[PDB]
Short mmCIF file of C-alpha atoms in Angstrom, two decimals:
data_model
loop_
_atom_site.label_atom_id
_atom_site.label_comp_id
_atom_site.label_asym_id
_atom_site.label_seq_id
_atom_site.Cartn_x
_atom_site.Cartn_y
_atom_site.Cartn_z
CA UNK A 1 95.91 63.91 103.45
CA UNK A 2 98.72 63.98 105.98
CA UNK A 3 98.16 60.92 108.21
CA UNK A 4 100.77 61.69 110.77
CA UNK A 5 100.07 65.36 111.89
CA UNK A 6 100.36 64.91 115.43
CA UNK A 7 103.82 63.22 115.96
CA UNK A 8 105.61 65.93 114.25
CA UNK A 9 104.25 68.21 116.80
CA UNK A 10 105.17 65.56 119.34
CA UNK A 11 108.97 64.95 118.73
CA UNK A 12 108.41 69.18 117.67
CA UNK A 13 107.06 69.28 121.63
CA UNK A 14 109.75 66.89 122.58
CA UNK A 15 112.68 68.64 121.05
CA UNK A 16 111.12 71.73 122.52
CA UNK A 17 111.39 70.87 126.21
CA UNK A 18 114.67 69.48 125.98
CA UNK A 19 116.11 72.12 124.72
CA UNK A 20 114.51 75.00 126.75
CA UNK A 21 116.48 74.81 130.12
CA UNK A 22 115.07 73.19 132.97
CA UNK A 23 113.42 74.65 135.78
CA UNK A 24 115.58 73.14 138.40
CA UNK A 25 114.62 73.55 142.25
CA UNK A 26 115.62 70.03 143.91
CA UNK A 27 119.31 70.89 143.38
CA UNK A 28 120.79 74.59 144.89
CA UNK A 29 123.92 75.12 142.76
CA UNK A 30 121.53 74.98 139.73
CA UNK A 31 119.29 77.55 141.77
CA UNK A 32 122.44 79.84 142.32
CA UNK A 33 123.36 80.26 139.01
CA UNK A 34 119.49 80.31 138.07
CA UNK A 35 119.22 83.40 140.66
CA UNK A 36 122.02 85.02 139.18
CA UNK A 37 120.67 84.52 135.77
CA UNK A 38 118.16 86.85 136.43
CA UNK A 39 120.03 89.14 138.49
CA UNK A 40 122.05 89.92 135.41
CA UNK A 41 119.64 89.28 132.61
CA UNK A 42 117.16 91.44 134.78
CA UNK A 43 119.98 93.65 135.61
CA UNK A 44 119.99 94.44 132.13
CA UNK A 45 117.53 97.06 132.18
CA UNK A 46 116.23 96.73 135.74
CA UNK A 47 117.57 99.93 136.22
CA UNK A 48 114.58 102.14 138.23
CA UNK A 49 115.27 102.27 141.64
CA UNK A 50 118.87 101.69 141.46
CA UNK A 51 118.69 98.23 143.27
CA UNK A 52 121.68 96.35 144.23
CA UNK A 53 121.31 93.55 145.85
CA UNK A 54 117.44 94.24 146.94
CA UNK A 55 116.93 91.88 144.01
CA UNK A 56 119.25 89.47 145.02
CA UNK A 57 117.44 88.77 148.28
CA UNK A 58 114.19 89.95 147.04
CA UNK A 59 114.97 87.26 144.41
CA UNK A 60 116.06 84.29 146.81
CA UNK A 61 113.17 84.86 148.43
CA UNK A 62 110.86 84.96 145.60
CA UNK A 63 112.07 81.76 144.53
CA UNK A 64 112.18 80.51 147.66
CA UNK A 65 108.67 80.92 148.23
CA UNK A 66 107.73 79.64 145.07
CA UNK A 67 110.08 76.18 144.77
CA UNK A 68 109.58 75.98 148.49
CA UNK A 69 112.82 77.03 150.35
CA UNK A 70 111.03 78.04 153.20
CA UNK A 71 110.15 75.86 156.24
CA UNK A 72 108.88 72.60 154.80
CA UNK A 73 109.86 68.86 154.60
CA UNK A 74 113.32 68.46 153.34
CA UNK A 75 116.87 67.33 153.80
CA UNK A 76 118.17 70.90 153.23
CA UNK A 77 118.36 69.82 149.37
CA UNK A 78 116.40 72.16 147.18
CA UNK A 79 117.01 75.54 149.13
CA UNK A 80 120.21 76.54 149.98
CA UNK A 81 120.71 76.99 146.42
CA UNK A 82 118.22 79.57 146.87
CA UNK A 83 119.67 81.95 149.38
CA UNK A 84 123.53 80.56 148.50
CA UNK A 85 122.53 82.35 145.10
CA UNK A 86 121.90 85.56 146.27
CA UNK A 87 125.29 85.55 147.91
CA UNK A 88 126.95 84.44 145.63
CA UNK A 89 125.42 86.77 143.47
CA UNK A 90 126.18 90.44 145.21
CA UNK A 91 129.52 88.75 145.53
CA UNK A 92 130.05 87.89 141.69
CA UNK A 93 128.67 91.38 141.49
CA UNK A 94 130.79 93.30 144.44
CA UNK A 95 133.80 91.78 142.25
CA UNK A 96 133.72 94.30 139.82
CA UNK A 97 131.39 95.62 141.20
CA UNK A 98 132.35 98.50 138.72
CA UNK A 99 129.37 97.88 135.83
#
């Protein structure tokens, strides 16, 4: 009759978390590269509409509105990642901009 049970799927949860990537949001850089993570990994097969940078804005703004990059209380900390993403997205895009 295990006795423990539970811990294992503590340290299992712990592990877990720490691994897994964080969300981020109070920093930007983190929230650039974040943006562009999906911009590419999305890119992938986001191909539909032929977007270009539609989801690089549409995207800042998305996460904008969800971390809270839009007018609110802050010392211009955890947006300008936000919006700095997308450009520096359809610019690490317009590079090769080739793919």
């Amino acid at each position: 009759m295990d006795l423990i049970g539970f811990g294992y799927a503590a340290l299992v949860t712990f592990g877990s978390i720490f691994g897994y990537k964080r969300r981020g949001g109070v920093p930007s850089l983190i929230a650039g590269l974040f943006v562009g993570c999906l911009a590419g990994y999305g890119a992938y097969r986001v191909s539909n509409d032929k977007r270009d940078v539609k989801v690089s804005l549409f995207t800042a703004f998305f996460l904008a509105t969800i971390m809270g990059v839009r007018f609110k209380r802050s010392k211009k900390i955890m947006p300008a990642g936000l919006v700095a993403g997308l450009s520096l997205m359809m610019i690490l895009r317009l590079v090769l901009l080739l793919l």
